[PDB]
Design a protein around this ligand. Sequence first.
Ligand SMILES: *[C@@H]1O[C@H](CO)[C@@H](O)[C@H](O)[C@H]1NC(C)=O
Length: 311
Amino acid sequence: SLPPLIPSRTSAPTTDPEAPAMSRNGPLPSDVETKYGMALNATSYPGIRAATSQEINELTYYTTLSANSYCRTVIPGATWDCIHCDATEDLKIIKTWSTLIYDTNAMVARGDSEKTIYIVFRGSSSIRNWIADLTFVPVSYPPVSGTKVHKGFLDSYGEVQNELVATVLDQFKQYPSYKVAVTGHSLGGATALLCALDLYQREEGLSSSNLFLYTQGQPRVGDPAFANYVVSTGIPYRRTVNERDIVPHLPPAAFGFLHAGEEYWITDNSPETVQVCTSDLETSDCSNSIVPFTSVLDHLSYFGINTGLCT
Ligand SMILES: *[C@@H]1O[C@H](CO)[C@@H](O)[C@H](O)[C@H]1NC(C)=O
């Protein structure tokens, strides 16, 4: 089935970006519960540029797709019948999945106006429980020698991969000038990253010019070597983080994980303001500046869209 991994795209390729804030921001209130040392329920706060309106609208669109994937009318229903489905109702839904073991919920859709093939991954069906229960297990990332990722993320993608890639590549063969855009929130953003890499590694026709990744509230996926491999692909990668959202800080960088993907940090919703840390590897200068004063609640809304409950 799957087209083979391409050698030239699987070639093997830093400081801790959270450590300054962990040093500066001091201890949490004793009444604050933590996960991996990051607050679950802190209630306050302890180059760079501001994104433009067009950038914000684009990030909001992909957030909307991510959010709509939690609606059972959309996956497995394959219909656009939900609170924010008016935004995406022109897309043709090609296929959806709800896998058996790892409960990976995903979809492929095509927008002919947009000339875009969309891949969307849902996060967990129980986000609070997912965060609480997260336990990180670094394992070899099989495509690329000398890199590691968390096993559970590989497991989540691997169960849907063979059918999903086959569906995407069929669409791409039929619409060759279309872009392919991958999105997900939370766990779905980790799955989305693995998917974008897989498409890059197996389809010569996809590259930085026509393969895009957008994630919201995405946890760290692998080690610095992995992160450096992701940067080496050149895939446009916009990683959005809402305010004090804990999940982009899990696992903590001190445990040996690192983000790739330019950070788009929402710092205000009135008016919507996004601070962009213009580096391909994460920095100390955006949301990593506020650890450990993180929040589960900031994971549950992006751009005023509820992310994780279809409301
Ligand atoms: C955090 O959650 C714990 C456990 O549910 C609770 O005891 C504590 O009051 C909470 N703190 C804040 C600041 O919300």
